[PDB]
Amino acid sequence: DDKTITFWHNASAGEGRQYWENLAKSFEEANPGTKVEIQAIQNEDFAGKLQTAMQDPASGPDVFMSLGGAKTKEMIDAGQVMDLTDKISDTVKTDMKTTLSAATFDGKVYGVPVSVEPGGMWYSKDLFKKAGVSDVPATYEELLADAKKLKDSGTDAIALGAKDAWPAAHWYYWLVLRECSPEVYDKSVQDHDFSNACWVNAGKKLQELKDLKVFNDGFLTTTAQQGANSSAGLLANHKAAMELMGAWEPGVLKDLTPDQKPMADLGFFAFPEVAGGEGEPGALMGGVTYFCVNPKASQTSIDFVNYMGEKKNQEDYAKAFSTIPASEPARAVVTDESLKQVIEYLDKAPSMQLWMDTALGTNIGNALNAAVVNMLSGQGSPEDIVKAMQDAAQKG
Ligand SMILES: OC[C@@H]1O[C@@H](O[C@@H]2[C@@H](O)[C@H](O[C@@H]3CO[C@@H](O)[C@H](O)[C@H]3O)OC[C@H]2O)[C@H](O)[C@H]1O
Hints:
Largest sheet: 9 strands, mixed
Number of domains: 2
CATH architecture of the largest domain: 3-Layer(aba) Sandwich
CATH topology of the largest domain: D-Maltodextrin-Binding Protein, domain 2
Structural class: alpha/beta
Order of helices and strands: EHEHEHHHEEEHHEHHHHEHEEHHHEHHH
Assembly: monomeric
PDB class: transport protein
Name: sugar transporter solute-binding protein
Bound molecules: a molecule of 3 linked components (XYP-XYP-AHR)
CATH class of the largest domain: Alpha Beta
Distance between the termini: 38 Å
Number of strands: 11
CATH superfamily of the largest domain: Periplasmic binding protein-like II
Keywords: transport protein, solute binding protein, probiotic, prebiotic, arabinoxylobiose, ABC transport
Entry title: Structure of the xylo-oligosaccharide specific solute binding protein from Bifidobacterium animalis subsp. lactis Bl-04 in complex with arabinoxylobiose
Radius of gyration: 20 Å
């Protein structure tokens, strides 16, 4: 039925999951005859499920969440994503000007942005003060010193969801961004060239952190977002002082607290600078989430993604997910103090790179993430990370 659509997203729990149900219901109410069938998928399963399903578009989802960067382009090249250049609404064109570039490939728009999530450190202001950290660390050495103080003060300095691999890899991404010159970074990512020494130095700096033993003890078996003992869960329940994460963080924390209300003393600060690094000061890394349409989908799917972009729906999105909506005017309803600081951060950043693994693609990205975990587990080295990336890059 041309008016029945299958909708895949990654909000498997909490208010985010309920938001999509409500949006679907409101869409069905506003467009009688339409039916939205939802599949709420756990984030760590999403890419695998989507890529497998879209090998046969005729039986794949009509509307699905983006993977981002080269991972999107992979799907575009394979004929698994509809060009929406001439399909997106004036509302989207107007309100998502800044974020549409993330969904734009070869001058063509392939999705409707719904959220923007810069990365950085999310921390407990209370645990920081208890360790004698009165100022967020401007530099990496100061961050390391602060971790020592947090450890001495009887808490786990850094929550790390290393079982999911990418949360660990985020430390590596940021260190490369801080170490590599903007030129080397852009060329390295575009050409898949990882020969510059900065790719090794970043690994060595991360190994230094790991050898301080300031992670939560079970970090290798810790997921990012599943349960009270996930890395987000540890931060939410003040069992750990900080974690490096995207700006979806506040909404994940709020559903892992014992009363499932927002974390009271949540603070944010940008990933610090690295002495001797030639990275651009203030450079941002993050993600933009947009929703895509199956090339075989009907106009009903197009209407649904455009419906997401409507100001009221983006405002409800911001409230449900406690994150930054892609729609600029919708950002007015953002109340969380740390999110307001990230928005400012975002508004005057010199540039924003996409998450390194998404920017590099599935093969390199997955190889990189696993290699970072191997080093953190002591079964690998900084050199092995580069070798893993190079090996994977041979396939593309
Ligand atoms: O918009 C609010 C919620 O946040 C997004 O979901 C995020 C998702 O984007 C994130 O993807 C990670 C990003 O880092 C990459 O390195 C990694 O490969 C990738 O898996 O995972 C966390 C999840 O909360 C969605 O827009 C929405 O659920």
